[PDB]
């Protein structure tokens, strides 16, 4: 089960893992890349930014 | 709530899915928002799909004991 941290390094690991940069990723996603930089380190952000990014990564979350 | 569940989430249907989650243990929103260490209007406002910090939905997850998982 995914908290604020381990969803973080959830997107970190999905954006490394498709080979984009925090800049293309955050371009891509809508989001500034200070932002994607928040989210991945687990800092507090609107649910929203966090939906853009899961979104632009193509991320899916569902209940377990 | 079927159908929720059936698909990957979103702002909306994480919402439904902690209103129906809640229905279902039996509580209202007074019982549950104090079970969260939430405000009424703050489990108010996610449960219709409104924007607010992703901590507070996690308090609210964490209080109805609601897991969330990678698909």
Do not use: H, W
């Not at 293309?24 to 890349?33: I, R, S, W």
Request: proline fraction near 2%; charge should be positive.
């Amino acid at each position: 089960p995914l908290n604020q941290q381990s969803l973080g390094l959830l997107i970190k690991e999905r954006r490394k893992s498709a080979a984009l940069t925090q800049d293309v990723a955050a371009m891509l996603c809508g989001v500034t890349k200070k932002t994607l930089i928040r989210v991945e380190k687990g800092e507090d952000v609107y649910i929203s930014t966090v939906f853009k990014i899961l979104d632009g990564l193509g991320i899916d979350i569902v209940s377990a």
